[PDB]
């Protein structure tokens, strides 16, 4: 895609079960999802 | 060393900036309300 990404490559939106919309902020969702379980990973 | 130097030498070469801006002749002063002189109850003054 010339600009950013496109819905069909991202795929389904796991939070709603349908194709991801055309304004979704996937970057922040990815960051939050990766960072939330940080406290469970015992150092 | 030359590669590192050219990065800062080239910036002033093309952009509207000039080296003379690195030395100051006059110093700006921020508006008073962003450095308030408030009078606490009891006469004590608090500065910023």
């Amino acid at each position: 895609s010339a600009v950013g990404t496109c819905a069909f490559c991202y795929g389904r939106s796991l939070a709603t079960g349908k194709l991801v919309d055309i304004g979704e902020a996937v970057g922040i969702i990815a960051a939050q999802s990766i960072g939330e379980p940080g406290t469970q990973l015992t150092m | 060393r030359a590669l590192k130097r050219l990065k800062v030498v080239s910036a002033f070469l093309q952009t509207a900036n000039s080296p003379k801006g690195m030395v100051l002749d006059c110093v700006p002063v921020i508006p008073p309300d962003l450095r308030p002189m408030v009078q606490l109850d009891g006469g004590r003054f608090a500065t910023s």
Partner: protein, 171 residues
């Protein structure tokens, strides 16, 4: 001279600085010799000045504190983060004043044109410029005392137990 003229954020003239220094020296000497904090009367008698003058001199020499002094053990705030801005526009008061203005304009509308006009031009509602009785008479082409008569009539009309209750709350 320079120290007296540059050692304080709020400058104090040389003579008042001398007075403050002398008072501090006398107070320290009295504390040392006597062994107890001097009461204001003792300093007033020793320094040969009224107790009020001593209190004022004491209040002049205080130095200001900073708004950046930390207060919490963690350090999440400063001394200037809890200073309430006591000179801002409280939205409730502003809307109350706007409603008062609207209500006053509405009430003054029920009056006759002449009475409302004289009241407005006497209290300067439209322009904020109070005017004398003679000028009002000139615009109305009547006597000064006659204009004074009209103002009293309207003033009593509004202060009546038939039109007051619409304005009682705002007072």
């Amino acid at each position: 001279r320079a120290m007296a003229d540059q050692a304080r954020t709020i400058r104090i003239p040389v003579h008042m600085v001398e007075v403050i220094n002398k008072l501090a020296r006398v107070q320290r000497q009295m504390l040392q010799d006597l062994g107890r904090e001097p009461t204001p009367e003792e300093l007033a008698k020793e320094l040969d000045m009224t107790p009020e003058k001593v209190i004022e001199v004491q209040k002049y020499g205080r130095e200001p504190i900073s708004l950046h002094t930390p207060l919490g053990e963690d350090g999440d705030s400063e001394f200037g983060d809890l200073i309430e801005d006591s000179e801002a526009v409280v939205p409730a008061d502003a809307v109350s004043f706007t409603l008062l203005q609207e209500q006053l304009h509405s009430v003054l509308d029920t009056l006759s044109e002449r009475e409302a006009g004289v009241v407005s031009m006497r209290f300067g509602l439209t322009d904020g410029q109070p005017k004398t009785l003679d000028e009002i008479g000139k615009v109305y082409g009547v006597t000064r005392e006659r204009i004074r008569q009209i103002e009293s009539k309207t003033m009593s009309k509004l202060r009546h137990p038939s039109r007051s209750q619409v304005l009682r709350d705002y007072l």
